[PDB]
From Swiss-Prot:
The keyword DNA-binding does not apply. The gene is rplE. The keyword Ribosomal protein applies. GO terms for biological process: translation. GO terms for cellular component: ribonucleoprotein complex; ribosome. This is one of the proteins that bind and probably mediate the attachment of the 5S RNA into the large ribosomal subunit, where it forms part of the central protuberance. In the 70S ribosome it contacts protein S13 of the 30S subunit (bridge B1b), connecting the 2 subunits; this bridge is implicated in subunit movement. Contacts the P site tRNA; the 5S rRNA and some of its associated proteins might help stabilize positioning of ribosome-bound tRNAs. GO terms for molecular function: rRNA binding; structural constituent of ribosome; tRNA binding. Belongs to the universal ribosomal protein uL5 family. HAMAP family: Ribosomal_uL5_B. Part of the 50S ribosomal subunit; part of the 5S rRNA/L5/L18/L25 subcomplex. Contacts the 5S rRNA and the P site tRNA. Forms a bridge to the 30S subunit in the 70S ribosome. This is Large ribosomal subunit protein uL5.
RNA sequence: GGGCAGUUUGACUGGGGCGGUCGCCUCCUAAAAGGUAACGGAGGCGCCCAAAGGUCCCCUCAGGCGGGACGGAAAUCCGCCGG
């Protein structure tokens, strides 16, 4: 389904707002979202491979995309890990399904958070990408109450043709991100 | 069944005994071919794998810095440098 608000938001709204703000010279040099990665630090489900399926299928309806995993390379002896075996969920979303995830983020995910305050502005990686943490993934639409067996956490990532955080800062505000000033 | 009989009871070894060692692999000693000794200096082997093998295809690390709900000295993830 190639169409949505954020599909056009970036275009008939953000496209020229940037050309004014920074003034490019070519249609491509303009900062674009193009890669949303979603991650999970599930060292917890080290034991239960069952709870592995839940964070995965939940991820399915929230990310609107099939989920994937990744076991470690040199695993922490101390915290119950050793070699190739463990677990760390990961699911890169691109094209349009990326958008349809984002629309749920700044218009549903954020507005109903336990005392959400604003996306920490320091979260820019010096270059043009963003990373931010969430505790409850039940703030997502499809997730019902009597269904979650535990508060599994995770953290999202969004890659941008941005070359500096200023340029990224502007490009996320313009698409619609509730920054903590 | 030492009453009795025949015998056995290793070598190296700055004397012999005691100690240590005894075959195989790696490095040094070794003097830029090879090979070289010492009771010279140091470490391993007496296995393991049906996937840890064949071939086809695909991808490429460790680490350093920056960023990320548990966790950051080191899980998993995005980025950039990284032969
Ligand atoms: Mg030119
Ligand atoms: Mg005789
Ligand atoms: Mg003798
Ligand atoms: Mg002697
Ligand atoms: Mg002896
Ligand atoms: Mg030599
Ligand atoms: Mg020689
Ligand atoms: Mg010869
Ligand atoms: Mg000779
Ligand atoms: Mg394997
Ligand atoms: Mg293997
Ligand atoms: Mg760090």
């Amino acid at each position: 389904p190639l169409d949505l608000a954020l599909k056009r938001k970036y275009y008939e709204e953000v496209r020229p707002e940037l050309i004014r703000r920074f003034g490019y010279q070519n249609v491509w040099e303009v900062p674009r979202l193009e890669k949303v990665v979603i991650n999970q630090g599930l060292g917890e489900a080290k034991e239960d491979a069952r709870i592995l399926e839940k964070a995965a299928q939940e991820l399915a309806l929230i990310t609107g995309q099939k989920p994937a995993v990744t076991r470690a390379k040199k695993s922490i002896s101390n915290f119950k890990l050793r070699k190739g075996m463990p677990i760390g969920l990961r699911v890169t979303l691109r094209r349009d399904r990326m958008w349809i995830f984002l629309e749920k983020l700044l218009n549903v995910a954020l507005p109903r958070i336990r005392d959400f305050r604003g996306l920490n502005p320091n979260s820019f990686d010096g270059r043009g990408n963003y990373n931010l943490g969430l505790r409850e993934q039940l703030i997502f639409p499809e997730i019902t109450y009597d269904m979650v067996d535990a508060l599994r956490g995770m953290d999202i990532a969004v890659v941008t043709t941005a070359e500096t955080d200023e340029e990224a800062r502007a490009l996320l505000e313009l698409l619609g991100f509730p920054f903590r000033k």
